[PDB]
Paper text:
To gain an understanding of how [name] represses gene expression, we solved the crystal structure of [name] to 1.85 Å by a single-wavelength anomalous dispersion method. The ligand-binding pocket of [name] is largely hydrophobic. Within this pocket, we observed an elongated density resembling a long aliphatic chain of a fatty acid. Gas chromatography-mass spectrometry (GC-MS) of the compounds extracted from [name] purified from Escherichia coli revealed fatty acids commonly found in this organism, and a palmitate molecule fit well with the electron density. A fatty acid carboxylate formed a hydrogen bond with [name] Glu-70, and the long alkyl chain had numerous hydrophobic interactions within the extended ligand pocket. When we purified [name] under denaturing conditions and refolded the protein to remove the lipid, we observed the same EMSA results as we observed with protein purified under native conditions (data not shown), suggesting this fatty acid is unlikely to be the native [name] ligand; however, these data may suggest that the native ligand is fatty acid-like. Interestingly, we found that Trp100 faces the ligand-binding pocket, which suggests Trp100 interacts with the natural ligand. This hypothesis is supported by our data showing an Rv0078W100R mutant was unable to complement the [name] deletion mutant strain (lane 8).
Author numbering:
A (entry chain A): 5 to 200
B (entry chain D): 6 to 199
Write the structure that this text describes.
Amino acid sequence: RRTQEERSAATREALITGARKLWGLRGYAEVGTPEIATEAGVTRGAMYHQFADKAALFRDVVEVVEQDVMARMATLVAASGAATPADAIRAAVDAWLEVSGDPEVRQLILLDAPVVLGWAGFRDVAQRYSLGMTEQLITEAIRAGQLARQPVRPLAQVLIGALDEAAMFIATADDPKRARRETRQVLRRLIDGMLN
Amino acid sequence: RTQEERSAATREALITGARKLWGLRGYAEVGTPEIATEAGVTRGAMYHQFADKAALFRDVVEVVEQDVMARMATLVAASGAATPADAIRAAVDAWLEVSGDPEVRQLILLDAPVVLGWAGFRDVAQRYSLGMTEQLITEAIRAGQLARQPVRPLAQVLIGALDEAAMFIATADDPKRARRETRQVLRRLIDGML
């Protein structure tokens, strides 16, 4: 026997896992909640006990994917050997271009999320984690004397705007391999210009 | 009067009314009946000019983009900028002024990427503000004022930064200080870029 809180937690995770998989492959518009409930092996009644509607489930999917994106990026940044805050910023660019190239991340984060959530929803749900990490890297680069002292939150929001748009440019390009290479170069120059 | 004069006046009334109402309340909050009513057009005539709500939005974005391009060009010329690099610098101030218009933010920044999709909006902006940015970047490179690099990605990434800068100011608890701080970080980023 499982306790009710245990069954509720296992039900919730199965739905997030199933929605993430199916929406990742086919897009938010192409998969309904009945097919997701079936995929998770849960009844529709249990599903609607965890999530009021389709959009509430998508929001949780986005949160979980974004957390995964950050963890994957931290691994790539650690693998780059970056040993200063500025070098971590440079590596975070390449890490983002690699992870956002994941077809599931492309579908869920780049194509679906800005449309399903709107601007304010995407900032609050999707962007908040990356914005916080970016603010920290900026603060540390200023502390280390690698970046001129300046307002941290506006600069972080501007960088995130540039990085999100870079991923969109690659994701929609008729030659994504080429677009990724060109975009990587302009982003590296933009970061190097931002720094000392 | 002439038949095309009628359709053109009908088309222009629908775009003007849709621009105004969607500008004030957002695409999702105004239906085509309220727009036809604002424009003084019948439900049949409005349908004859625009197949669906999104088709009308596409023409609204075109004229708004045109207005943004013209306002940006006017302010940059008015700033006294006389080199491509100074024109790029002046565009920061010009955009922060033009983007203080809530209709511009609602239609271009909030609605357009949702209603048209990102690539669908790009197809419109490439003929207007995006194309203009690409040209200014090309000229700064030709002048040796900007490091040679892929023009199309740089133009689009810079616009992405400017889009979010405008939204950061608009939602700030203190918008007046946010505009000053955001101008500073944008100027520093551009000056480092040049």
